[PDB]
């Protein structure tokens, strides 16, 4: 769950046609995918290489692309060890499952 | 080398349909109020005039 | 384009909805006018219309 990493400043606002995919990238193909980023879809916002966080896989990345151009991203780029990370992000959407969690045990407890 | 130049061409083949099927949609919604002006002005006042020679 | 060219894009949208919003308006304007001068054209006919009655009576 990505409560935590992924905020609201991460993603396009208003976007009349354009899905910014949470394109994670492992370390093996990070510079491959910021410098084919645009190329990796058509009709790809140009310079839209933005670089959100990271884990013990894989360095998540994102970037800006047409509405019927992420079926052809995730074509050209499930191939090169790209992965699409498809999430939503809302103010208590994240924060009510911590709320669940620890409720749940002090509860119990 | 693409830059702002491959920025205009994206904006470009955008602007081909953003505003271009608008200016169709609006234009046709003028023409639908031309068409209907003359069917509003041959269909109520006509019962206006049905009603009046009945009078008559 | 990521800060001028996307909102090229949206306010090109919103040039978008300004046509649409005028032809709206245009529509309504439009159809008021046809119910006005409607009227006055049944109005005129019915002017006719009584003064051909006072020439029957």
């Known amino acids: ?109 | 080398a693409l830059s702002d130049a491959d920025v205009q061409k994206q904006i470009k083949h955008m602007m081909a349909f953003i505003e271009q099927e608008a200016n169709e949609k609006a234009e046709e919604i003028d023409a639908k109020a031309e068409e209907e002006f003359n069917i509003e002005k041959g269909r109520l006042v006509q019962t206006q005039r049905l009603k009046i020679m009945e009078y008559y | 384009s990521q800060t001028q060219g996307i909102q090229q894009l949206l306010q090109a949208e919103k040039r978008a909805a300004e046509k649409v919003a005028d032809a709206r308006k245009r529509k309504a304007r439009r159809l008021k006018q046809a119910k006005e001068e409607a009227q006055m054209e049944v109005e005129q006919y019915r002017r006719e219309r009584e003064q051909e009655f006072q020439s029957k009576q």
Do not use: G
């Open chain 1, 1 to 109: 769950s990505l409560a935590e990493i992924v905020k609201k400043d991460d993603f396009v606002l208003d976007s009349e046609y354009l899905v910014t995919l949470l394109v994670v990238v492992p370390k093996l193909n990070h510079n491959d995918w910021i410098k084919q980023y645009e190329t990796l879809a058509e009709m790809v916002v140009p310079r839209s290489s933005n670089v959100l966080s990271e884990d013990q896989d894989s360095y998540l990345c994102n970037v800006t692309l047409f509405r019927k151009a992420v079926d052809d991203f995730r074509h050209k780029a499930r191939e090169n060890k790209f992965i699409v990370r498809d999430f939503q992000y809302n103010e208590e959407e994240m924060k009510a499952d911590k709320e669940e969690m620890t409720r749940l045990s002090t509860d119990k407890k």
